[PDB]
């Protein structure tokens, strides 16, 4: 169906594998040379993008107005390739979303789409004891290797996967104002 194809097109055109010293993560290319990754990926001066050593020109760890981490890190990459602009799919406000999917690349044998079900704007949680804001929660047993996975519905790019406890999974919310 179109929602599955939209997800496969996000993988094909707007995803990459980001390797840092903390492991491999699914990276979302937002536009131009800007890619997002979970903050806990801890990208250094150089990362790998699909195995290619790439200098990071600038890195921006995003925080809310109270100085709480959003678990979104924006990276400007020193590479020739430009990502298709997907900002128009990113919502302007916090909300709930029924029947969402996660598009996974890193740590998978091939591009994978997981149907995670209904998503709710969940507020702040503690991820390994650290307060993290603007969480999107789903009742799906997400696992190790899923981080950076892209939360989406047809025509909507909603978040990036950051954590879970074996029952629930959590994404850092993507808001359009972060990138405009
Ligand atoms: C993704 C990390 C990844 O793929 O790295 C590749 C090298 C995982 C996903 C997680 C693992 C188990 N199920 C999942 O969905 N993320 C983590 O392991 C995160 C990570 C972290 C993220 C942000 C800030 C600090 C640390 C390390 C801890 N973590 C977790 O998900 C923990 N869960 C919680 O703390 C938690 C809190 C709540 C309300 O639910 N879960 C796990 C205990 C490891």
């Amino acid at each position: 169906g179109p929602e599955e194809e939209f997800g496969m097109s996000l993988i094909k055109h707007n995803s990459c594998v980001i390797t840092t010293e903390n492991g491999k993560f699914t990276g979302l290319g937002v536009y131009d040379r800007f890619v997002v990754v979970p903050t806990h990926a801890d990208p250094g001066k150089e990362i790998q993008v699909d195995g290619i050593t790439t200098k990071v020109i600038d890195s921006y760890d995003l925080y809310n107005k109270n100085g709480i981490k959003l678990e979104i890190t924006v990276l400007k990459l020193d590479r020739n390739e430009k990502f298709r602009d997907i900002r128009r799919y990113i919502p302007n406000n916090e909300d709930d979303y029924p029947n969402c999917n996660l598009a996974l690349l890193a740590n998978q044998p091939e591009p994978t789409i997981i149907n995670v079900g209904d998503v709710v704007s969940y507020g702040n949680i503690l991820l390994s004891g650290n307060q993290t804001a603007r969480m999107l929660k789903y009742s799906y047993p997400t696992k190790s290797g899923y981080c950076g996975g892209v939360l989406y519905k047809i025509g909507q790019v909603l978040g990036i996967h950051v954590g879970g406890n074996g029952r629930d999974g959590f994404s850092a919310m993507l808001l359009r104002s972060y990138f405009t």
Side-chain angles (χ1 to χ4, degrees):
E3 186 169 87
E4 190 187 344
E5 291 291 79
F6 172 71
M8 289 305 288
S9 175
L10 279 177
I11 293 170
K12 176 166 180 205
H13 296 295
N14 291 87
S15 89
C16 59
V17 177
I18 301 296
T19 308
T20 73
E21 295 287 356
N22 290 6
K24 296 172 181 186
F25 302 76
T26 291
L28 169 73
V30 182
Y31 78 112
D32 186 67
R33 278 58 172 260
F34 295 99
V35 71
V36 293
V37 293
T39 304
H40 79 272
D42 191 23
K45 300 294 187 68
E46 291 94 3
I47 59 169
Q48 309 175 30
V49 183
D50 300 325
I52 303 302
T53 302
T54 301
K55 296 177 82 190
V56 172
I57 300 173
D58 306 292
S59 68
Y60 307 95
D61 301 331
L62 304 191
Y63 293 80
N64 69 359
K65 293 189 122 287
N66 310 329
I68 304 306
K69 279 189 170 183
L70 297 169
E71 260 311 291
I72 302 284
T73 288
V74 185
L75 298 184
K76 196 188 178 186
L77 304 183
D78 186 16
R79 64 205 299 258
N80 298 128
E81 183 168 359
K82 286 179 164 106
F83 287 108
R84 165 180 70 149
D85 190 355
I86 55 71
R87 293 178 291 181
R88 73 196 170 96
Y89 306 134
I90 305 183
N92 297 299
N93 314 117
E94 311 199 24
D95 213 341
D96 300 332
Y97 304 94
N99 201 39
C100 296
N101 305 291
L102 269 183
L104 305 173
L105 183 70
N107 308 304
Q108 310 317 302
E110 65 180 280
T112 308
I113 302 301
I114 304 301
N115 165 226
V116 301
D118 303 340
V119 177
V120 297
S121 172
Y122 200 74
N124 296 23
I125 71 185
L126 295 172
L127 286 169
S128 280
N130 301 288
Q131 187 167 183
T132 311
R134 292 187 198 158
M135 296 284 91
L136 288 175
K137 179 198 133 276
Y138 25 101
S139 296
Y140 192 89
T142 51
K143 61 207 292 275
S144 58
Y146 278 31
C147 291
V150 185
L151 191 73
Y152 86 86
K153 287 182 68 155
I154 191 171
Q156 306 189 269
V157 174
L158 304 176
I160 60 147
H161 189 78
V162 301
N165 57 23
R167 306 182 84 89
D168 298 326
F170 303 90
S171 277
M173 191 184 287
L174 286 170
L175 293 178
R176 208 179 300 154
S177 56
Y178 296 176
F179 311 110
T180 65

